Enzyme design. Structure first.
Site, short mmCIF file in Angstrom:
data_model
loop_
_atom_site.label_atom_id
_atom_site.label_comp_id
_atom_site.label_asym_id
_atom_site.label_seq_id
_atom_site.Cartn_x
_atom_site.Cartn_y
_atom_site.Cartn_z
N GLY A 86 -4.85 8.08 -0.04
CA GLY A 86 -4.32 6.81 -0.50
C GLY A 86 -4.16 6.75 -2.00
O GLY A 86 -4.75 7.54 -2.73
N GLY A 87 -3.50 5.87 -2.72
CA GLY A 87 -3.46 5.49 -4.11
C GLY A 87 -2.27 4.60 -4.35
O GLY A 87 -1.93 3.98 -3.55
N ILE A 99 0.85 -1.19 0.00
CA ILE A 99 0.00 0.00 0.00
C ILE A 99 0.87 1.22 0.00
O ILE A 99 1.94 1.20 0.60
CB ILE A 99 -0.86 0.12 1.26
CG1 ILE A 99 -0.06 -0.35 2.47
CG2 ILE A 99 -2.12 -0.71 1.10
CD1 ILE A 99 -0.82 -0.19 3.77
N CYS A 100 0.41 2.27 -0.65
CA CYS A 100 1.15 3.52 -0.59
C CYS A 100 0.25 4.65 -0.12
O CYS A 100 -0.56 5.18 -0.87
CB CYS A 100 1.84 3.82 -1.92
SG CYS A 100 3.55 4.42 -1.71
N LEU A 101 0.40 4.99 1.16
CA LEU A 101 -0.26 6.13 1.76
C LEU A 101 0.57 7.41 1.48
O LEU A 101 1.78 7.32 1.27
CB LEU A 101 -0.39 5.87 3.26
CG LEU A 101 -1.63 6.32 4.03
CD1 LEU A 101 -2.88 6.31 3.16
CD2 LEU A 101 -1.83 5.43 5.24
#
Ligand SMILES: [Zn+2]
Lengths: 73, 69, 187, 155, 78
Positions: free
Chosen positions: E77-78, D90-92
């Site tokens: 987020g993404g 995941i990339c926050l």
């Protein structure tokens, strides 16, 4: 010598003191019947690991102000 | 002239203040050595007396600088 | 005259530096901790005020800041300061301030050498900023949600924190929480 | 060494203050020794969402220059969410060197930030293709797969 | 009464406040922000899981004394 343990229900955090060398049974029931709830109604966690009976806090490298979660079932 | 004896006066204050720091440190060591009970407090109390000296010296020092124009 | 003027200010700096060292030493080595220190600061404050006054004619300094904060730092080193000062009926005062934590955000250890920024006011340990500003000459402030960009050149040795830390380490040397009345001793 | 001391204190701060339900600890390596650069964590799902009752594992892998560069965070193998990668990454935004990461960002800020994205998937930046097709195609059954992955994770 | 005691923490440091029930929370956010050395838009505030709006006063939210506001980092987020 003797350390201080915050036990959190979810909202309230009744806060205790034990000899480093005392099996965590005692704290568990202390909380339990300070809640009136009976013991095997409750699950006590620390580092996401279910704490078992005989485990002294000295084992688990606890300190002043560490938190012990208390869930149900 | 008056300006000068004032100046040399100040420097005396400064150096007085410094040696008092040292002394304090030194006895703050003598106490961190924690040395059955009496001298500990005794030493500690002299220390208190020394901080007084310090606050008073600053006192002299300050009003003393009214005379450098 | 210019030399004499500058030379004088040299003397005054050492004076202030001298007040600094006494104050520091005062806290860094006290034994009883109540309102007996109030008389301490009182003398020291008045002395400073006097001194500053004379300088005003003659020929800001952090020492002053330190002095107007110290009484609070005493009662509780982690205090936030009711720095908002009641402009008439400011009815949303920032009362009791509260609690700040005395650990550097970067090292995540407590402070051994506070180093306040000047573009913002973000206090980081020397070792922290120095490691962060290694290589890169300018980076965004390491505090979150701060836009000012910052180089190694923007930091001064923070005295406020040094006190708050010195106070705090003393204000536990004896006892931090003691036998907390809320600490049910499980037999 | 500073990276390591950082993590060591980080651990004991976690133990003293961390959101109820969550957990975080480092892993043992093949020695029996602690790998303070790799962590197991569990993120519980917000009650009243289909993610409720779910407590989801992520690992945190801290680089050698933490906190200069931020850590990578990974949900399991093929986690089902519009913004998790198929690799589980995941990339926050706060988790991004190039965006908003700073050395003052709490672990607590990170877990909280993740769990918020659980029932707040930002659709402007999908990171997976099953999860996003279904999130726009029919949430009807998307929610269903959400509930199986939700129930899945209560060990 | 008329004023209330609010606690406003951000996960590290916390700041107590006294506030007329009718003061719009604009001035409180601004206060915590300009006080923390942080930028406004790079924050979101939560009273009991509500994203508070700037000109919404404390009795609109039926706050009481010793209630808490959390200041998190506005993120995505993404
Ligand atoms: Zn900054």
């Amino acid at each position: 010598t003797h350390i201080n343990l915050k036990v959190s229900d979810g909202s309230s955090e009744i806060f205790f003191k034990i000899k480093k060398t005392t099996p965590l049974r005692r704290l568990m029931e202390a909380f339990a019947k300070r809640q009136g709830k009976e013991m095997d109604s409750l699950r006590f966690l620390y580092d996401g690991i279910r704490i078992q009976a005989d485990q002294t806090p000295e084992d688990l490298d606890m300190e002043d102000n560490d938190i012990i979660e208390a869930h149900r079932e | 002239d008056e300006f000068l004896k004032a100046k040399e006066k100040i420097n005396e204050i400064f150096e007085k203040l410094n040696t008092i720091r040292d002394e304090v440190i030194k006895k703050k060591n003598q106490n961190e050595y924690y040395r059955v009970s009496q001298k500990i407090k005794d030493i500690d109390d002299q220390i208190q007396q020394l901080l007084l000296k310090q606050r008073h010296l600053l006192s002299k020092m300050a009003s003393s600088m009214k005379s450098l124009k | 005259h210019m030399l004499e003027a500058r030379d004088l200010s040299n003397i005054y700096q050492q004076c202030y530096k001298q007040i600094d060292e006494t104050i520091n030493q005062l806290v860094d080595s006290t034994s009883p901790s109540t309102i007996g220190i109030e008389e301490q600061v009182a003398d020291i404050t008045s002395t400073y005020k006097l001194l500053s006054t004379y300088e005003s004619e003659s020929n800001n300094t952090d020492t002053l800041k330190i002095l107007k904060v110290l009484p609070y730092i005493w009662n509780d080193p982690t205090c936030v300061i009711p720095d908002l000062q009641n402009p008439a009926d400011e009815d949303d005062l920032q009362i009791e301030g509260g609690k700040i934590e005395l650990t550097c955000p970067i090292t995540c250890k407590p402070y051994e050498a506070p180093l306040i920024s000047r573009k913002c006011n973000h206090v980081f340990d020397r070792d922290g900023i120095q490691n962060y500003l290694q290589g890169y000459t300018t980076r965004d402030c390491p505090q979150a949600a701060c836009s000012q960009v910052v180089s190694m050149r923007d930091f001064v040795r923070d005295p406020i924190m040094e006190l708050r830390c010195k106070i705090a380490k003393m204000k536990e040397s004896q006892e931090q929480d003691k036998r907390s009345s809320q600490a049910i001793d499980v037999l | 060494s500073l990276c390591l001391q950082r993590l060591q204190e980080e651990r004991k701060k976690w133990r003293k203050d961390h959101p109820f339900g969550f957990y975080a600890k480092p892993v043992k390596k093949a020695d029996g020794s602690m790998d303070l650069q790799k962590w197991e964590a569990g993120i519980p799902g917000k009650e009243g969402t289909n993610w409720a009752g779910g407590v989801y594992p992520i690992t945190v892998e801290y680089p050698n220059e933490y906190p200069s560069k931020p850590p990578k965070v990974k949900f399991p193998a093929g986690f089902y969410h519009p913004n998790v990668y198929p690799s589980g990454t995941i990339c926050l935004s706060i988790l991004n060197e190039d965006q908003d990461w700073r050395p003052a960002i709490t672990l607590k800020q990170i877990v909280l930030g993740v769990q918020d994205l659980l029932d707040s998937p930002n659709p402007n930046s999908p990171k997976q293709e099953p999860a996003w097709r279904s999130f726009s195609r029919n949430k009807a059954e998307y929610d269903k797969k959400v509930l199986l992955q939700a129930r899945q994770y209560s060990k």
